[PDB]
Paper text:
Ser 100 on the s2A/hD loop and Val 236 on the s2B/3B loop of β-sheet B were mutated to cysteines so that under non-reducing conditions, they may be induced to form a disulphide bridge. This forms a direct covalent bond between the s2A/hD loop at the top of helix D and β-sheet B, which along with helices A and H make up the steroid binding pocket. We predicted that by covalently linking the s2A/hD loop to the binding pocket, any effect caused by the movement of the loop as a result of the S-to-R conformational change would be amplified. The disulphide mutations were made on the T349R background to allow cleavage by thrombin. When binding assays were performed at 37°C in the presence of the reducing agent, TCEP, the change in binding affinity of [name]-S100C-V236C-T349R after reactive loop cleavage was very similar to that of wild-type [name]. However, in the absence of TCEP, cleavage of the reactive centre loop resulted in a 6.5-fold decrease in binding affinity for cortisol, as shown in Table 2. We went on to obtain the crystal structure of reactive centre loop-cleaved [name]-S100C-V236C-T349R, which revealed that the binding pocket was indeed perturbed by the presence of the disulphide bridge. Cleavage after Arg349 was supported by clear density for this residue, located at the bottom of sheet A after insertion of the RCL, and for Pro352, located more than 60Å away at the other end of the molecule, though density for Ser350 and Lys351 could not be interpreted unambiguously. The X-ray data also showed that the disulphide linkage has an occupancy of only about half, which suggests either that the disulphide bond is broken by radiation damage during data collection or, more likely, that even under non-reducing conditons, only about half of a given population of the [name]-S100C-V236C-T349R molecules have the desired disulphide bond at a given time. This could explain the relatively small effect of these mutations. (B) When the disulphide bridge is formed, there is an obvious distortion of the steroid binding pocket, as shown here by superimposing the R-state structures of [name] (pale blue, transparent) and [name]-S100C-V236C-T349R (coloured as in A).
The hormone binding globulins, corticosteroid binding globulin ([name]) and thyroxine binding globulin (TBG), are examples of naturally occurring site-specific carriers. These hormone carriers release their respective ligands, cortisol in the case of [name] and thyroxine in the case of TBG, when their reactive centre loops are cleaved by elastase, a protease released by neutrophils at sites of inflammation, taking advantage of the site and temporal specificity dictated by neutrophil elastase secretion. Upon cleavage of their reactive centre loops, both hormone binding globulins undergo the canonical serpin conformational change that involves the incorporation of the cleaved reactive centre loop into the central β-sheet A as a new β-strand.
Author numbering: 15 to 349, 352 to 383
Amino acid sequence: RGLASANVDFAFSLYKHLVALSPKKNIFISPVSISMALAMLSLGTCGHTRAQLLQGLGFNLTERSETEIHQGFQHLHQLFAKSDTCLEMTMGNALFLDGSLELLESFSADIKHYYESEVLAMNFQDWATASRQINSYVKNKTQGKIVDLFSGLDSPAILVLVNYIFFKGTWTQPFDLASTREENFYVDETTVVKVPMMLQSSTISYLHDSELPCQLVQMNYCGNGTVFFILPDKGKMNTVIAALSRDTINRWSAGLTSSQVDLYIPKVTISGVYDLGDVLEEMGIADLFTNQANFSRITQDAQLKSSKVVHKAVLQLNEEGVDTAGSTGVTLNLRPIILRFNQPFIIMIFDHFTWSSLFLARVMNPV
């Protein structure tokens, strides 16, 4: 139990669902961004809408109160803000509000207290300008990495909630630039591509999993960052992914041991863009999109529903470290061992202190 375990449960569930929907595509998401955005959103919900949303995010409202959930995300946000200076990290929230709406004071107080959310004015009557405005805001917070989060063709919103996350970290064990070389990467049975393959021969935290058919290594970045690189055995990608759980992570952490490893990992430049409505509904999070949605804690002068939940994430991974960003938007409307990663593999980016799932990747093609 606890926030950390719940957020991991949600992260892996979302990941599994997205992988199932796009069997041949790279997957890249920021679970913590999505969880934080929807948790903040839940502050405005009531009744069944609220109960369903919080359950979907992995929380049990018997056993834990809503206040405790929001306190959890507050401390999480606060710790990301106070990252070690060797890690450049940004993580925050914003609410864009049309002039026609007035937030109930309790809701405005809550989003400011728990999520430190900015509250910015927009003119939804001009969706072109408003969507450009929100996009610019997110682009700036992610230092240019997340662009065009919204389009002028999206259904106009009178309220938009945004979470952004960005960081640039350096490996505690970087790869030698001079040792990078082109190698074959086997996407599938009929597809082989040329990729820049990084190499280092080091004392690496390694595990050949005895319960799942996979090998993995843990690579740290400064500022308490940990990255799991997981290589499923041939033909076992789906088996490993389907099995991912909080218990799996605990087992890996306990089983990882220092070993001499010739570690080949390719440079990774990937991205993910998602309209999360359909997959969230598969996961039981649906009522908030319907004409029966209850957002009465935002306002009682109007009945709102969510129209769209969008998510974008980008990863740049190279010899020196990891540069990554993500953003989630919610719109509302009136109702030695040789280990070579030359086949599809999994990347998990965690904050070690909180065990927050910052990013998850399924890499089908690292180029």
